[PDB]
Write a protein that binds this DNA or RNA. Structure first.
Ligand SMILES: [Zn+2]
Ligand SMILES: [Zn+2]
Length: 70
RNA sequence: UUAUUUAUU
């Protein structure tokens, strides 16, 4: 998968252990975080779901603008 | 509208 180790392994960051071990598809260290190939218009238009429901099921992985302030 | 994204041995 192109998403391999593109996101932190949350169970490893929370408890320091992971049942997937060296085969875990998520990052156990920031040294393993790779670069995501994203659409050239990534976050250039307002996310309809976040600007309508106040939330978005894609979370920080959404390809559209949620809040313009960090 | 670019209308999208892996919780996985
Ligand atoms: Zn893990
Ligand atoms: Zn969104």
């Amino acid at each position: 998968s192109t998403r391999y180790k593109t996101e932190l392994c949350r169970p490893f960051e929370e408890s320091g252990t992971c049942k997937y071990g060296e085969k875990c598809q998520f990052a156990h260290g920031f040294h393993e975080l790779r670069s995501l190939t994203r659409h050239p218009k990534y976050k250039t238009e307002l996310c309809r779901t976040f600007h309508t429901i106040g939330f978005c099921p894609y979370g920080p992985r959404c390809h559209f603008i949620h809040n313009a302030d960090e």
